[PDB]
Amino acid sequence: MEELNIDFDVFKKRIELLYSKYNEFEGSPNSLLFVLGSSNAENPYQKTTILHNWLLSYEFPATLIALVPGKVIIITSSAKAKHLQKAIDLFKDPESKITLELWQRNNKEPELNKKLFDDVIALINSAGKTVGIPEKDSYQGKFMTEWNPVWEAAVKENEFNVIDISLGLSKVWEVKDVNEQAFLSVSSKGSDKFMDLLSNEMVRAVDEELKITNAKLSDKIENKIDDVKFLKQLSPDLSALCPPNYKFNFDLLDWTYSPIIQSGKKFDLRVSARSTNDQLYGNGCILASCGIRYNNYCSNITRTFLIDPSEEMANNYDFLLTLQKEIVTNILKPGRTPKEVYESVIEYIEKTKPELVPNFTKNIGSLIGLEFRDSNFILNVKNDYRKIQRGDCFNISFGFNNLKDSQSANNYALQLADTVQIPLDETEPPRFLTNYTKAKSQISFYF
Numbered sequence: 001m002e003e004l005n006i007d008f009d010v011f012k013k014r015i016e017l018l019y020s021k022y023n024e025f026e027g028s029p030n031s032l033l034f035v036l037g038s039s040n041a042e043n044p045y046q047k048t049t050i051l052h053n054w055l056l057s058y059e060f061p062a063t064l065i066a067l068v069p070g071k072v073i074i075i076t077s078s079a080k081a082k083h084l085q086k087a088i089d090l091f092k093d094p095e096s097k098i099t100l101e102l103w104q105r106n107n108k109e110p111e112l113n114k115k116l117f118d119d120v121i122a123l124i125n126s127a128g129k130t131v132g133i134p135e136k137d138s139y140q141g142k143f144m145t146e147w148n149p150v151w152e153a154a155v156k157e158n159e160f161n162v163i164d165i166s167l168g169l170s171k172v173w174e175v176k177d178v179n180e181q182a183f184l185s186v187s188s189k190g191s192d193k194f195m196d197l198l199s200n201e202m203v204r205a206v207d208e209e210l211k212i213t214n215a216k217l218s219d220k221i222e223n224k225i226d227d228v229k230f231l232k233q234l235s236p237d238l239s240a241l242c243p244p245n246y247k248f249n250f251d252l253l254d255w256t257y258s259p260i261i262q263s264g265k266k267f268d269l270r271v272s273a274r275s276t277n278d279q280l281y282g283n284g285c286i287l288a289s290c291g292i293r294y295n296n297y298c299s300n301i302t303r304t305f306l307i308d309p310s311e312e313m314a315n316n317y318d319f320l321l322t323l324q325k326e327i328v329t330n331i332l333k334p335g336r337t338p339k340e341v342y343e344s345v346i347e348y349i350e351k352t353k354p355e356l357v358p359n360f361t362k363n364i365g366s367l368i369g370l371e372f373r374d375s376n377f378i379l380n381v382k383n384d385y386r387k388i389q390r391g392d393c394f395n396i397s398f399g400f401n402n403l404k405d406s407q408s409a410n411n412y413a414l415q416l417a418d419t420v421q422i423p424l425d426e427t428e429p430p431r432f433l434t435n436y437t438k439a440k441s442q443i444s445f446y447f
């Protein structure tokens with residue numbers, strides 16, 4: 001029986017990175033503490049889950065991880081400890097200042113579990129009074145019900161200074177190493193392939209005047225991820241982009257979020273957007289967003305399709321393209337804050353199409369990676385506390401909403417998103433990881 005596939009050298013590298021950084025997080029925690037209950041596929045981007053994905057490339061439910069000076073402690077099931085066991089010997093070599101311990105808990109014995117919880121809490125206390133945790137994280141289940149009161153009691157008794165480490169974590173894993181950059185490329189290639197399918201399906205549905213809602217059409221695209229025939233078609237392209245020594249594996253392909261299709265006269269350009277249960281409207285502007293996730297690495301692509309567009313629709317789409325090229329080539333530079341980047345975008349728009357400024361989205365996207373949307377790295381005027389770094393990957397996403405076509409008086413919107421990697425190398429321009437066509441001639445259809 002084959003064990004779970006985990007890269008322990010990467011685990012060791014990343015644990016040692018975290019350890020080299022965490023005392024310098026805001027508020028200087030003596031210890032880090034991560035507790036993960038039951039998994040939820042419908043809320044997959046909590047910091048503790050992201051930590052598991054970054055460390056092990058798998059989420060481990062019902063598992064505690066603590067970092068204290070000189071020690072990582074993992075409390076988990078006997079089956080889960082079996083996945084991890086070989087990692088013990090790796091930390092023994094004279095280089096590392098850290099040992100790894102795996103403490104085996106059991107679903108069916110609350111007294112063993114409580115005692116293990118007691119023991120880890122005592123070690124944390126021995127390290128000091130400041131305990132760093134992802135404060136926003138919420139998990140359910142039996143493990144959590146055993147943990148929560150034991151932790152609550154400890155904070156009081158030990159007078160722990162419990163602090164949020166969400167910003168520190170975002171910073172530790174922000175810059176993508178070469179393998180992550182490759183997994184992002186794979187993710188993005190997937191997105192291109194599903195967008196191609198989407199455009200092909202949308203056209204046929206419009207041409208044939210199907211009875212079908214935006215939501216049913218986007219559900220049809222979503223469900224193709226379960227179609228091995230379709231998966232086999234895109235295999236060569238995605239496998240070609242996997243890093244050496246990390247073989248393409250279909251098991252590792254998922255959705256970042258449910259695909260979005262929008263049509264009609266009312267549009268939503270914010271992350272809150274969901275396909276509506278209205279009939280697909282085969283005229284004007286159609287907005288589609290896809291984001292495949294490969295090996296936990298998120299991507300994003302948004303395209304506008306123009307059906308029998310008016311001149312103003314087409315002309316504003318040309319500008320949308322010009323703006324994207326300006327943002328990526330000239331504005332999105334290492335060393336700049338999100339606020340500086342966003343202000344520079346408004347400046348450019350005010351100089352070229354000032355009338356479009358009130359219609360512009362309030363951000364131009366965000367840092368992307370293991371987390372779809374890092375809320376400490378949204379590209380808007382509010383963020384003046386991060387600098388862009390070489391190695392950062394972004395979802396660059398923006399649009400113009402509530403545009404009125406003059407001769408029809410019809411409302412419309414335009415939207416464009418790609419996933420863009422900033423190379424580690426300074427001589428290298430940003431790379432588009434998503435390369436599905438955005439040329440006006442290729443996204444325009446006439447019926």
Ligand SMILES: [Cl-]
Pocket residue numbers: 269270271272363
């Ligand atoms: Cl948004």
Ligand SMILES: [Cl-]
Pocket residue numbers: 362363378380
């Ligand atoms: Cl915003």
